[PDB]
Design a binder for this molecule. Structure first.
Ligand SMILES: CC1(C)CC[C@H](C(=O)O)CN1C(=O)c1ncnc2[nH]ccc12
Length: 167
C-alpha cells in the first residue's frame, strides 16, 4: 500500500491521473519524482521548469554543479539528484526531443531508467514541449517499465484522450 490517490489503473504496474506533477509531488512526497530533463539539466520550461520553480531554483543550482563535474547526460540517460521539497529523490531522465530531431527509438532507453526504482511519480517522457506523441509515449512506458509508475498528466483533455485510446 502506498499514498497515491485518484489514479486509474492501466496495467499491473502503470497508473495514470490528471494532475499537476508539482502539486502531486508536494502532497505525496514520493521517494522518486521523474523530471523530463534535457542533457544539460537546464530546467527552463515544461515539466522541468515547473519542478525547478517549485524548488525555488535549488534544483537548477544542484544541476549546474552536477554538469560542471560530470558533463552532459546522454539522450536516453538519467541521473539521480535530490528531490528537494518535492520528493526524496529526483530522477532526471532525458527523453528524445523531437523538436531537436532526436531518434524516437531512444524513448524506450529513457523509460528503462525507471526500472531502477520500485515506485515513481512521473510525467510522460518526450511529451509536451519535447514534441512526441503522448499516446506513443504511453505505449512505450507500458511496454518498458516493470516497476510501479504513477503517471501525472497535466492537461485534462490529453488525459481523457490517453485513457479512452488506451489498449
Ligand atoms: C503538457 C505536457 C503533456 C507536455 C509538456 C510537459 C513536459 O513534457 O515537460 C508535460 N505535460 C503535462 O501535461 C504535465 N504533466 C504533469 N505535470 C506537468 N507540469 C507541467 C506540465 C505537466
Amino acid at each position: 500500500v502506498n499514498s497515491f490517490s485518484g489514479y486509474l489503473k492501466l496495467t499491473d504496474n502503470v497508473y495514470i491521473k490528471n494532475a499537476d506533477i508539482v502539486e502531486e509531488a508536494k502532497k505525496v512526497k514520493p521517494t522518486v519524482v521523474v523530471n523530463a530533463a534535457n542533457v544539460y539539466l537546464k530546467h527552463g520550461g515544461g515539466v522541468a521548469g515547473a519542478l525547478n520553480k517549485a524548488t525555488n531554483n535549488a534544483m537548477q543550482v544542484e544541476s549546474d554543479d552536477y554538469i560542471a563535474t560530470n558533463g552532459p547526460l546522454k539522450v536516453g540517460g538519467s541521473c539521480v539528484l535530490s528531490g528537494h521539497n518535492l520528493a526524496k529523490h529526483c530522477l532526471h531522465v532525458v527523453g528524445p526531443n523531437v523538436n531537436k530531431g532526436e531518434d524516437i527509438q531512444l524513448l524506450k532507453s529513457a523509460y528503462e531508467n525507471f526500472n531502477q526504482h520500485e515506485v515513481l511519480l512521473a510525467p510522460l517522457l518526450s511529451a509536451g514541449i519535447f514534441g512526441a506523441d503522448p499516446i506513443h509515449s504511453l505505449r512505450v512506458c507500458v511496454d518498458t517499465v516493470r516497476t510501479n509508475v504513477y503517471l501525472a498528466v497535466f492537461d485534462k483533455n490529453l488525459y481523457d484522450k490517453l485513457v479512452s485510446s488506451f489498449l
